[model samples]
Target chain A: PYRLYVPTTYDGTKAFPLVIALHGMGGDENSYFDSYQRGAFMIEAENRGYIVACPKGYVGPAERDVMDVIAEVRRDYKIDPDRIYMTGHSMGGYGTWSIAMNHPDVFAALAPVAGGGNPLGMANIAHIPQLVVHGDNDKTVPVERSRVMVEAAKKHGTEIKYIEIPGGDHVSVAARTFKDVFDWFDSHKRK
Target chain B: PYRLYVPTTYDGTKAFPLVIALHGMGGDENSYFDSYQRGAFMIEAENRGYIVACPKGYVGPAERDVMDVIAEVRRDYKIDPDRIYMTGHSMGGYGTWSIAMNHPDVFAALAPVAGGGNPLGMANIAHIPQLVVHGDNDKTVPVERSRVMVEAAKKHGTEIKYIEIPGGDHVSVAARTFKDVFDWFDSHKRKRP
Candidate 1:
C-alpha cells in the first residue's frame, strides 16, 4: 500500500499543520528520495505543530491518483482541515500550481520551484499564498514561466513570494530554499 | 504507483542521507498523514541533513517489495547511498526490526515504535541503533514487543535505546518522537559500502 508520511510527533491529540512536497517530471515518489528526508527532519521539531504529508503524484492518466493520494493522506491524518500547504519543483512545480489552484481550500500556501504554470488559470487562486522560485540562469525551462506567474500573482493580488536565485539553475536553489520557503510561508494563512 | 518522500534540500547535489519509515499493519502509505509535518520540516531547518523515502507496502502477499523500493529510491536519488536509516510505527515497527536485520548494510540506524518482531527472529540485527518507543496504554499492540527486541539487541551486542512511555499508548508518544527519531537517526551512518 502507498503510505504517506505523517509527522512523527503525532499524538492524534490536536490539529497539526500540513505540507506536501511534490516531485518533478520523470520521477515517482522516489524522485526526491534523497533531496528531502522523508519529511522526518522537519517533523522532529515541528511534528507537534505540523502534520506533513508527502503524497505521490502519478503522471498522465493517473494525475488524479496523485491528487487522490494527497486527499487520502489528508483524510487519514485527521489534519487541521486548515493550514494546508503544497509545493513542488520542475514538472512538480506545474503540478503544484495545478493542485493548489483547483483546491484552494486544501492549501493555505504554495511554493512552486523551477516550473511554470498558466497564470490565467490561477485567477481562482488569487487569494492563495503563491511563493515561486526560479533561477535566472535557467535554460531548460523558461524562467519567464515562473516570472509570468509572479506577474500574475502580483496582478491578481495573490499572496506570492518569488525567490529568483541569480545563478541557480533548475533544482539548484532547492536545497537553499528549504527553510526560507517555510518561513516565507509562515506569514500566510489559508483563507 | 508507490510514493517516497525525498527532500529538495539535498537536491541531488551531495551524497545525501537516507531513512526508511515503514508503516505498520492496518496502515499503508497514508499512515503518517495525521502524525506530523514529516521530512520537509527537518530539511527546512537544515537539520535532517539527508534524503528520505517512504515505500508503499502491499498486503495479501508476503513480499519484499518494501526493500526493493528502498533500493530503487537509492538508485534514483543522490543518497549518501551508504548511510541509510529506518523507522516505523505499529505494523511498521515489525518492519523496522525485520529490515534492519535482513539487510544490515543498507541502514546505519533504526527507530521502531509501538511494534515488534520475534526476538529470536532478530538475532542477526545485534548491532544497530535500535531505538524503541512504546506506550503503556497501547492496547492495539503490546509494548512488550519492544521489550523483547531490546533484550535481543543486548544479548546480540547490538546497540539499543528503549523508552517505555508511561502514558504512551499505541500512538501517544508519537507526538514526542519526531524530533528525537530524526535527530537520533542523524547521528549515525553506514560503515561505508
Candidate 2:
C-alpha cells in the first residue's frame, strides 16, 4: 500500500519534484497520511508542491516497491528528471540512507531521520548531498547511528548537514526538523 | 466526503489560509484531486501554502457539511481565520454563492465559476471581494449567470474581477482561470475591525 500526494499547484505545463517518503517499522503506507504519526509528511508534501510517494513499510526488499512507485509517478505525472528526493524516519531513515546509497543516481539529495547506515558504504553516494537529523538523547536509535554516517560522508569529502538536537529523542525530532529538512532539499538541486 | 491538501511548508507553528473548493454536479470530493479536472487547484494550494478542502457533491444543505470539514481542519490543523475563501464550478458555483450568502461573514472572498447566485442576498456579502469567471461559449451554464451576479455585486460597490473567456466553455474554464482566481484571493484579506 502507498499514499500519493499531488500538490494543487501542478499544471502539467511544468515538471514537479517527486519526493519518495518511506515509512518506519510497523508503520504501513498509510502512516504518512494517517493522524497517528508522520502525518506531517503529508502536510509537507502538500506544502512543497512535490509529488510525494509513501511506500508501505521499510523491510526486506522494500527498495523494489519504492522504485515501482517512483516509476509509476514518473509515468503518470509531469516529474522533473533531476529533482527526486528520498527521506524517512526511524527504520525508514536507515532505509533512506541504504536505499539511496545503492541507487544514488536517482535522487538529488537525501534526509535520514533517527536512522543510520554503514559508514563504509558512504563513498557510494558521496556525490549526493545529505541532511541528517537525530536527537542527542535518542534511545531507540542512538544518536551515534547518525554521527558515524555523517563522519563517514565527511571522510569522503561529501556534503552532509548533521543536525544533532540537544535533549531531543527519537519521536519528537521528526516534527522538529521538518522545516530544516525541506530547506536543505530546496537549496540543493541535481545538475 | 472531502479531500484536504495541506502544504508541506506548513509547520503548524503558524496559521495558514483555507480555501473550500466545491465540485460541480456529478463530481465527488475526489474530482478536484483527479487528473482530468481541478488538479490544478491542489497544485496551486501547495504553491500558495493554502490548505484546500474539496467537498463532495453539493446536495441540500451541503454548506453544513462544508463547515464540518472546515472545523475539523481548524481543529486538527492550523488555519487562518480571516483568510478563508470559497470557490466552485457549475452547481458548485451556485453552492459557493449560496453558502457564502447564508454565512456571509465566514469567507474573505468568493469566486464562482459558470454558476449564478441570488441577487437578493448580494448586499449581505458586499464586504467580501469576489472574482467571477465564465466562458462566453458556455452552453451548459450561460455566461449570463455570472454576469448577473457581477452586476449585483457592482450595485453594492463590492470589489469584483469579472472575466468572460472567449471560445471557452463550462468545462475548460476551470483549469484556465485557476491562476487568476488564487491571485485574487491572495490580494484580499478580511477587513475585521
Candidate 3:
C-alpha cells in the first residue's frame, strides 16, 4: 500500500501535479511523508499543492516498486503529465538516481539527498535536470559519490544543481534541503 | 491486457529497449502489433531485438492511457530507460505528438503517422528527435497539420525527419512508414547530460 496526501485546496477539477517520494533502504512508504526531522516534507507538499505519493516498496530494494507506484498514482489521479517529479533520502537517494536514470522519461526533475548512484548512467539522462545535495561531513555515504555524478553530468552538459553544506551531516542535510527542492521542482516541468 | 512481443534473442539478464505502439483513435491495442496489412511492426522488433508493447488504453484517451501503460511496462520489464520510443497512426499520431510533448523526458524519439498536434508545444521537446510522416492528398487529416509541426521543429532546430509520400493517403501511409520508424529508433538514444 502507498500513502497519499492531497492538499485541502484539491478539488480535482484541474490537473494536479504529482510528486512520487521514495523511502530509504530501511525506510518504508511513510519515510519521506512523515519525517522525524520536523514536518518540512509534508509542509512543502501542502504548501505547493502538489499531490504526494509515498510508497513502502515492499521488504527489499525499491527499484521496481517506484515504477509501480508512479503507474498506480497516474491511474487514480488526474495528474499533469508534464509536471511529475521525484526525490528521496539516503538509500532512497540511490534509488531516485538509479530509477530516474533507468526511466529517464518519466520525471521532469530529480533531487537526491545524502545518497549515491552509478556515474556511468549520467549520460543517458542529460535531458533531465537534477538537484544533488550532500553535506561535506557525510560519512555513511561519501560526498564523493555525488561529486562523481556531478562531474559526469557536468562533462556531458546535463543541467545540475549541486549544493554542498559545510557543516551538514547525513541526517541534518536531509532536513535542510526540503524547501530548496520544492523551489527547484516549482521551477521545472516535463515540457 | 495489451500484447507484449519480447524478442527471440532476448536474454533475461540484460535490459532491452522498449517501443510503445499506440493505435488510431477508434482502434484497439492489437491494431498495430496484430496488423494484417504487413505485420511489419512485430517483424521489426523481432529482427532488432526491441521489446514491443501494444496497450489497449481503453481506460482513457491515448494521452493518459499511454502514461499508464508505460509505467506498467517499466514495472514488469527491464526497460532501457535511455532508449524508450513511441509511434502511432492517425489518431494515434496526434496522441504520439501530444503525449511526447507532455512528457518529453520519457522518450528518446517519436514517429507519428497521418496525425497532427499543438505546434506551440514544439519548443518544450526541442531535446527530442522526431520522425513526421504524412500523405500529400488526404482529406481526413490535412497535410498542413504535419507541415506546421515540421516547421515548428525546424524553427526550434529540433532534429526531425519529414517524409511526404507522393501518392500516400491517410490509411496507406501507416503501412508504408513502419520500417523508417524502427530505423529512427535504432539510430537515437537519450542524450547524456
Candidate 4:
C-alpha cells in the first residue's frame, strides 16, 4: 500500500521537504504509519512537510526494486532537494544500506533502528550520514552483530553513530530510539 | 547491485558529511547508479571530508521507504551528524518534498530539480533550507509549474531559491543541476541542534 503525510501547506507550486520511511520484514506501509505516525509532531516541528511513504520489504538482502522507489517519487513531488532523508527498521534497515550503497548521490540524513550492515562494503558509504540503533537484550536480531558492524565502520572512519539502548530490546528500542532520532534529525542540515 | 563512491581517509577517524541522491520516474536503483556515479567524486569529497549516497526510489509513487534507507545508512556509516543533504532529479525530485515534509527533522538541506509537487500541501516544509531548479524550452514538464510553486511557497515565509534554465529543458536539468546542488549542499546545514 502507498502512504503519505504532507504538511498543511504542501502544494506542488513550491518545493517541500521529503522523508522516505520504510517498514520491516512483514511490515507494510500501513505498519510504520500505525506505529510511529510522527506526522503531527513533524508537521508541528516545521509545518511538518511530508513523510513520503512507508512500505514493507521482501526478497531478503537482494531486493532491487525496493531500492527503486525513491526515483519514482522525485518525479512526482516538488521536493526541497536537499532535505531528503531515509529511515527504516530490521530488514528495511538492511534495504536502506543496500540502496544507500547503490546510490550515493541522494538523501541528506538517515535514522535506522534495529538494523545493521557492512558499511565497508561500499567505499563511499563513509560519506553517507548514518545512525544505527539496536537493543542489547533483543533476540529477534543479535545486538552484537550490529555492534560489530557499527564498530567496524567507525574503525574504518566511516561517518556514522551506533546507539545502544541500555536494557532496551528490539521492540522497546524502536519507539524511544526513533523519538530521539527525530530530534537528532532536527539538529542537522544538507550542508 | 549496490553501487556508491567512498572517498578515502576523510580525517580517517572523524564522521564525514552525508548526502542522499534520489532519482526520477521510470528510473530504478540501477539507472540512478548508471547516471549519477558520484562514487569517484565522493572519494574526492571524502578526501575533503564528505559523503554521498544515491539511493533508489520505488516504482509508482511510494517514497516513504527512502527514510528507512537513510536511517539504516546513518546507523553504521559514522556520519558527521552535522551535515546531511538531500536532492533528487525529475521523479526523484518530487519525492524529495514528499519525504522531507514528513521528516523535516532529519535533514540539513534539500534541493529538487525538474520535479513537480505543491508545498502548500505541506506546511512544515517552512523550517527547512531548500533550493529548487527547473528548465525552459522544449518541455517534458512545464516551466511555470516551478514558478508557481515558488510563488505560492514564499507566502508561507519558507526559505527556498528557484533556478530556471534559460534554454534548457528536462532530462539535462537533473544532471546540469547536480554541480550547483553539490555546491549548495556543501554550504548550508541545520541550525540549533
lDDT of 4 at B126: 71
**Runs with alpha carbons beyond 4 Å of true place in candidate 2:** A1-191, B36-38
Worst 10 residues of 4 chain A by lDDT: A38-47
Model 4 per-residue lDDT tens digits across residues B51-162? 6666655333344467666677778687866688778776566667767776767788888777666647445777666888988852434576567667766877767888
Interface RMSD of every candidate?
Answer: 17.9, 23.7, 22.8, 17.6
The docking category that best describes candidate 2 is incorrect
CAPRI grade, predicted model 3: incorrect
Clashes of 2: 15
Highest-lDDT candidate: 2
Q: Give TM-score values for chain A, per-prediction.
A: 0.85, 0.94, 0.94, 0.82
Which residue pairs in model 3 clash with each other? A29-A55, A29-A56, A105-B105, A105-B106, A123-B192, A126-B192, A126-B193, A156-B193, A158-B193
Q: Mind giving the per-residue lDDT tens digits that candidate 1 earns over A1-191?
A: 23355556677776667667776433446545444455432543273355554455422434555557657776777766557777777657877887766666677788888777667877878877778888887643558788888888888777677889999766566656777667756667766
Overall lDDT per candidate, in order of appearance: 0.66, 0.81, 0.80, 0.64
Quote each prediction's TM-score: 0.47, 0.49, 0.49, 0.47
TM-score of 4: 0.47
User: Over the stretch B9-125, how does candidate 2's per-residue lDDT look in tens digits?
Assistant: 999999999999887643568878884343778888889999998877542446678878888888998888999999988767888888888888889998988788677789988
CAPRI quality band, candidate 4: incorrect
Clashes (N, CA, C under 3 Å) per candidate: 45, 15, 9, 132
Q: lDDT by residue for model 1 over B1-193, one digit each (tens)?
A: 3555555566666777777776543345655543334533234224656555565642222226777777787789877755788787765676677666667667788888877766896656665667788887665455766887788778877767888999786656664787778777767766533
The C-alpha stretches of model 4 lying farther than 4 A from their native spots are: A1-191, B36-48, B58-61
How does residue B72 of candidate 4 score in lDDT?
72
